[PDB]
Each structure stands twice: as structure tokens, then as C-alpha cells.
Design a protein around this ligand. Structure first.
Ligand SMILES: NC[C@H]1O[B@@-]2(O[C@@H]3[C@H](O2)[C@@H](COP(=O)(O)O)O[C@H]3n2cnc3c(N)ncnc32)c2c(OCCC(=O)Nc3nccs3)ccc(Br)c21
Length: 164
């Protein structure tokens, strides 16, 4: 069920690989997040943002789930839309890609993060398998059908591959 997705970094000839078990919820994407130790920090981020990540313990005042805006955005693969890229304290560096997409409507972790930083919350699975909405070509498909179609579309565009 898992898929590795390549997000294009806006303004750069560079890609970020993220992994999701829930690729059918991609139209609910509000952000992407990498671990503190992700090499994209040293490769692409400003001295000031690198300095912050190396000097400061990332811990929340109000909420435990917190992050640092990287100064980088990612292009949504199916919408004419940019997503902010964060370093977040709840992403494991050594687990899969050390990088996630945020779906606050359907992931309780992403939800708390999105609330903390006023990031968009976009519902895409109707409460009942359940029906997709706010999801363009996935609209009206069951979660099962949508999982199949989204992976086909990602593979067709060469931006996603099935990953066990
Ligand atoms: N967030 C949006 C969407 O993407 B999912 O979020 C990603 C990914 O699919 C999933 C990993 O899949 P897997 O268990 O290895 O098959 O966990 C998050 N993740 C992947 N790399 C990660 C990493 N370095 N550090 C922390 N977290 C990671 C995800 C959900 O996941 C549930 C399972 C989970 O939580 N599995 C976990 N595995 C290890 C820590 S959490 C649930 C709902 C939704 Br809508 C989603």
C-alpha cells in the first residue's frame, strides 16, 4: 500500500522524496515535513535556518508538535498550488525517507501541527468503503478505488513508485 512520492522543490532543479501509506489523501496535503537531520537542510536551506536547526532544541511552548519553516516550498503534484516545507520534531530521520506529506484532516499528528501554524485543513474522505471528495479525479471513488487510481497516476507521471 505504501508509495514514495517525488515533490518538486519550487524555484530549484531539486526533488524531495516523501513516503505515505495513504496516497489517496494527497489532495488534503497542507505541508511537507523532514526530520531535523535530513540532508536537504545542509544542501538547500539558508545559513540562518541551518544555524537555528543546529543551535536550538526544537520543543513546543503550547503544543508538543512543532517545526521550523525551511524557506522552501514544494509543488503539489496534481494542483497548481505550493506547500510549505517544514523541519518537524515528530519526523524520524532513519525511518523510510525521513520525510512526510501532511494531511491534517486524516492524520491526528498533522492536524495538531496544522492547528499550531494555521496551515490549511482539507477534508478528502467522507465519514461513512468511504467516498473521496475535494480530490479532483478521485471524487466519488471508494478509498480502495482511489488508492489504485492515485498510484497509477503517480506512476504515469514518473513521480511515485509502489514501495513495500
Ligand atoms: N501523514 C499523511 C499520510 O502519510 B502517512 O504518514 C507517513 C506514512 O504515511 C506512514 C508510514 O507508513 P508505514 O507504517 O511505514 O507503512 O507514517 C508516516 N511517516 C513516514 N515516514 C515517517 C517518518 N520518517 N517519521 C514519522 N512518520 C513517518 C500517514 C499515516 O500513517 C499511518 C501509519 C504510521 O503512522 N506509520 C508510522 N511509521 C513509523 C512512524 S509512524 C496515516 C494517515 C495519513 Br492521512 C498518512
Amino acid at each position: 500500500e505504501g508509495v514514495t512520492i517525488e515533490f518538486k522543490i519550487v524555484g530549484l532543479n531539486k526533488k524531495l522524496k516523501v513516503f505515505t501509506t495513504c496516497p489517496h489523501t494527497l489532495f488534503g496535503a497542507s505541508f511537507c515535513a523532514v526530520a531535523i537531520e535530513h540532508p536537504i537542510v545542509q544542501d538547500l536551506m539558508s545559513k540562518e535556518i541551518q544555524d537555528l536547526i543546529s543551535s536550538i532544541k526544537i520543543q513546543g511552548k503550547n503544543n508538543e508538535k512543532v517545526g521550523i519553516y525551511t524557506g522552501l516550498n514544494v509543488k503539489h503534484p496534481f494542483l497548481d498550488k505550493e506547500l510549505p516545507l517544514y523541519v518537524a520534531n515528530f519526523v524520524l530521520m532513519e525511518y523510510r525517507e525521513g520525510a512526510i506529506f501532511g494531511c491534517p484532516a486524516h492524520d491526528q499528528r498533522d492536524f495538531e501541527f496544522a492547528q499550531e501554524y494555521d496551515l490549511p485543513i482539507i477534508p478528502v474522505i467522507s465519514s461513512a468503503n468511504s467516498i473521496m471528495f475535494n480530490s479532483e479525479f478521485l471524487n466519488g471513488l471508494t478509498v480502495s478505488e482511489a488508492r489504485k487510481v492515485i498510484v497509477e497516476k503517480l506512476e504515469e507521471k514518473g513521480i511515485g513508485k509502489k514501495t513495500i
